[PDB]
Amino acid sequence: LPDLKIEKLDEGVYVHTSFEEVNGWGVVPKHGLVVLVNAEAYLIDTPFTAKDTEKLVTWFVERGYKIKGSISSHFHSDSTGGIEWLNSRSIPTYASELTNELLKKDGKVQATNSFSGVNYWLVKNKIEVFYPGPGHTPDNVVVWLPERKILFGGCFIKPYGLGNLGDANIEAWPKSAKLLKSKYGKAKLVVPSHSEVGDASLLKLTLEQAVKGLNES
Numbered sequence: 001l002p003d004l005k006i007e008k009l010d011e012g013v014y015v016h017t018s019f020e021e022v023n024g025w026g027v028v029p030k031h032g033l034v035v036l037v038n039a040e041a042y043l044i045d046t047p048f049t050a051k052d053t054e055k056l057v058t059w060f061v062e063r064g065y066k067i068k069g070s071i072s073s074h075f076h077s078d079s080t081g082g083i084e085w086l087n088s089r090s091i092p093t094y095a096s097e098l099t100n101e102l103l104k105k106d107g108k109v110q111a112t113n114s115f116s117g118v119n120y121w122l123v124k125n126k127i128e129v130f131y132p133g134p135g136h137t138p139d140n141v142v143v144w145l146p147e148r149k150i151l152f153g154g155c156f157i158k159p160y161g162l163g164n165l166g167d168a169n170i171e172a173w174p175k176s177a178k179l180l181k182s183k184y185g186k187a188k189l190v191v192p193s194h195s196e197v198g199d200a201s202l203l204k205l206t207l208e209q210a211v212k213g214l215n216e217s
């Protein structure tokens, strides 16, 4: 397995990339973010595992940053894998109410703090959370960074294929993807979980793939 990767994407914004072999998928890359505010750091999705979450946190703490919190974009373990270890270290963990419920049903440890509704501020005017409706999973949310115009789409952004449909709502995904295109068309950078960073076009491509996936069912 390739090592945890951490790259500067923009000023105060980093992409972390972790890797896990998944049956019927091979080695799966997973992108998340670290967002820097003053001398504080926010995890946008945890890596797959506690070890890599520890590795990631250590890298930033070692640079003089405090980890103020982590937000998980959906319940799957490529977003939540690290919640246990963070909780154990009293670092505040965030996820939607839906996400927390699905983690519970799945017999997984939940995030300490939750939220619900359409729009949520994790940090006022710096880190916004938006729930477009079901798609890749019932609970998938996106994270918007206003200053830099960066959107983390998580596993909802699927420009070339929908990927793992095990917990997908193919019926709702096109509608959800339309609402996401309307609101965030002004994004400079769009960060998918499982493919590379693109511009606002990735929103359109996601919509087409959702529509195409529905037609096929």
Ligand SMILES: O=C(O)c1cccc(N2CCC(O)CC2)c1C(=O)O
Pocket (backbone or CB within 6 Å): 022, 025, 028, 076, 077, 078, 136, 155, 162, 163, 164, 194
């Ligand atoms: O979103 C995907 O397309 C995807 C691809 C490969 C592995 C995945 N998961 C990794 C985490 C594991 O808990 C379930 C599958 C996913 C996903 O559904 O997020």
Ligand SMILES: [Zn+2]
Pocket (backbone or CB within 6 Å): 074, 076, 136, 137, 155, 164
């Ligand atoms: Zn997923």
Ligand SMILES: [Zn+2]
Pocket (backbone or CB within 6 Å): 076, 078, 155, 193, 194
């Ligand atoms: Zn995923």
